[PDB]
Enzyme design. Structure first.
Site, short mmCIF file in Angstrom:
data_model
loop_
_atom_site.label_atom_id
_atom_site.label_comp_id
_atom_site.label_asym_id
_atom_site.label_seq_id
_atom_site.Cartn_x
_atom_site.Cartn_y
_atom_site.Cartn_z
N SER A 188 0.83 -1.20 0.00
CA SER A 188 0.00 0.00 0.00
C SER A 188 0.87 1.25 0.00
O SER A 188 1.73 1.38 -0.89
CB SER A 188 -1.01 -0.09 1.14
OG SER A 188 -2.07 0.81 0.91
N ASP A 218 -10.39 -4.10 -4.59
CA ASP A 218 -9.67 -3.22 -3.67
C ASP A 218 -10.23 -1.79 -3.75
O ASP A 218 -10.10 -1.14 -4.80
CB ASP A 218 -8.17 -3.26 -4.04
CG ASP A 218 -7.27 -2.59 -3.03
OD1 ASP A 218 -7.74 -1.61 -2.35
OD2 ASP A 218 -6.09 -2.96 -2.97
N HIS A 263 -8.20 -5.17 0.06
CA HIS A 263 -6.90 -4.53 0.06
C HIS A 263 -5.76 -5.33 0.68
O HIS A 263 -4.65 -5.37 0.13
CB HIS A 263 -7.05 -3.17 0.75
CG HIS A 263 -5.82 -2.32 0.66
ND1 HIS A 263 -5.18 -2.09 -0.54
CD2 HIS A 263 -5.14 -1.64 1.63
CE1 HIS A 263 -4.16 -1.27 -0.28
NE2 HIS A 263 -4.09 -0.98 1.01
O1 LIG Z 1 -3.07 -3.66 6.76
C1 LIG Z 1 -3.41 -2.53 6.55
C2 LIG Z 1 -4.16 -1.69 7.57
O2 LIG Z 1 -4.93 -0.67 7.07
C3 LIG Z 1 -4.35 0.11 6.08
C4 LIG Z 1 -4.77 1.40 5.89
C5 LIG Z 1 -4.20 2.15 4.86
C6 LIG Z 1 -3.23 1.57 4.01
C7 LIG Z 1 -2.57 2.42 3.02
O3 LIG Z 1 -1.31 2.56 3.06
N1 LIG Z 1 -3.28 3.16 2.16
C8 LIG Z 1 -2.62 4.09 1.24
C9 LIG Z 1 -3.41 5.43 1.20
C10 LIG Z 1 -4.90 5.14 0.79
C11 LIG Z 1 -5.69 6.40 0.78
C12 LIG Z 1 -6.82 6.69 1.56
N2 LIG Z 1 -7.30 7.96 1.22
C13 LIG Z 1 -6.48 8.51 0.24
C14 LIG Z 1 -6.55 9.76 -0.43
C15 LIG Z 1 -5.58 10.04 -1.37
C16 LIG Z 1 -4.59 9.06 -1.69
CL1 LIG Z 1 -3.49 9.42 -2.95
C17 LIG Z 1 -4.54 7.83 -1.10
C18 LIG Z 1 -5.45 7.54 -0.07
C19 LIG Z 1 -5.53 4.12 1.76
C20 LIG Z 1 -4.70 2.88 1.82
C21 LIG Z 1 -2.81 0.28 4.22
C22 LIG Z 1 -3.41 -0.50 5.20
N3 LIG Z 1 -3.06 -1.84 5.40
#
Ligand SMILES: O=C1COc2ccc(C(=O)N3CCC(c4c[nH]c5ccc(Cl)cc45)CC3)cc2N1
Length: 295
Positions: free
Chosen positions: A122, A239, A269
């Site tokens: 992620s 996802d 995800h």
């Molecule tokens: O095991 C787990 C636990 O929960 C997570 C939450 C976020 C993520 C993660 O790194 N994310 C990347 C950012 C994404 C996101 C959420 N709102 C946004 C608005 C703009 C942009 Cl460019 C990206 C985003 C969510 C997931 C990993 C996990 N993995």
């Protein structure tokens, strides 16, 4: 006589002197983890966690990799887990890349001549891509689990508007809502574990931090024609956090001669914490891919 100040502690009040750690270029302590085999390691592998989470969530993956005779290492990114910094704040997304590179450089001093791999999930996968793009030819390979290449198109739209509002006026506390934990995994036990972990930040996403995630997406797009590192890409088709279109874009635009995509039909995800049939496959595929490139 002057006296030394009280020992520096994690945000959970544990002295850093009692934990594996590293001080970054900004003078911030990063909590570290290591999983080393009994024998001489065949290679090193850095594990890069995602937004709001921390390195302890990679225990099982790390133990599997250590079982392949790799020395696995990780740290909590600044503002996460047991590392210092205001929670889910970063001055610029490059701080995360810089800090991975410092830790990789430090480990290569202690274990010279070994190949080094990256594993990221992620936001941690965007960090891995930018780390490998900054140092072409340095890394032996990269494992990406639902990397942040394209965000959910709706969340990207909503954040581009908030970024525009926050960048125009002075609103330091502006935040969006929290991540909907139900979209993380079809495995309800893993959703409940995520909601029970005190080291996870489940607060609303701050607009400042969202701007840095938008920056990561833009920088990843520019990095792809510079990406030559071998990689394995794992992506769920359902996802809602890292859009599957980004995985197809990475396969198309990266220059890497060794690139593989596996799609998990219907998966959410967090592929390494999904339904057992998916998780067992993810672990097996990573095991095969890394074993083939360390033999
Ligand atoms: O095991 C787990 C636990 O929960 C997570 C939450 C976020 C993520 C993660 O790194 N994310 C990347 C950012 C994404 C996101 C959420 N709102 C946004 C608005 C703009 C942009 Cl460019 C990206 C985003 C969510 C997931 C990993 C996990 N993995």
């Amino acid at each position: 006589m002057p006296e030394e100040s009280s020992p520096r502690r994690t945000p959970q009040s544990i002295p850093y002197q009692d934990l594996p750690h590293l001080v970054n270029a900004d003078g911030q302590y990063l909590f570290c983890r290591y999983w080393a085999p009994t024998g001489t390691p065949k290679a090193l592998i850095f594990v890069s966690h995602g937004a709001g989470e921390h390195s302890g969530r990679y225990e099982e993956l790390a133990r599997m990799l250590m079982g392949l005779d790799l020395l696995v290492f990780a740290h909590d990114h600044v503002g996460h887990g047991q590392s210092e910094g205001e929670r889910m704040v970063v001055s610029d997304f490059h701080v995360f890349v810089r800090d991975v590179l410092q830790h990789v450089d430090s480990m290569q001093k202690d274990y010279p001549g070994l190949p080094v791999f990256l594993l990221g999930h992620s936001m941690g996968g965007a960090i891995a891509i930018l780390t490998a793009a900054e140092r072409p030819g340095h890394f032996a390979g990269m494992v990406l689990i639902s990397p942040l290449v394209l965000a959910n198109p709706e969340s990207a739209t909503t954040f581009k508007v908030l970024a525009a509002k926050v960048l125009n006026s002075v609103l330091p506390n502006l935040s969006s809502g929290p991540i909907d934990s139900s979209v993380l995994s079809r495995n309800k036990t893993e959703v409940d574990i995520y909601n029970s972990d005190p080291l996870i930040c489940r607060a609303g996403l701050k607009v400042c931090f969202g701007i840095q995630l938008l920056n990561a997406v833009s920088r990843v797009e520019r990095a792809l024609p510079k990406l030559t590192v071998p990689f394995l890409l794992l992506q769920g088709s359902a996802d809602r956090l890292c859009d599957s279109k980004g995985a197809y874009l990475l396969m198309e635009l990266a220059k890497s001669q060794d690139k593989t995509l596996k799609i998990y039909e219907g998966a959410y995800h967090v592929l390494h914490k999904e339904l057992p049939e998916v998780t067992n496959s993810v672990f097996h595929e990573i095991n095969m891919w890394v074993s083939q490139r360390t033999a």
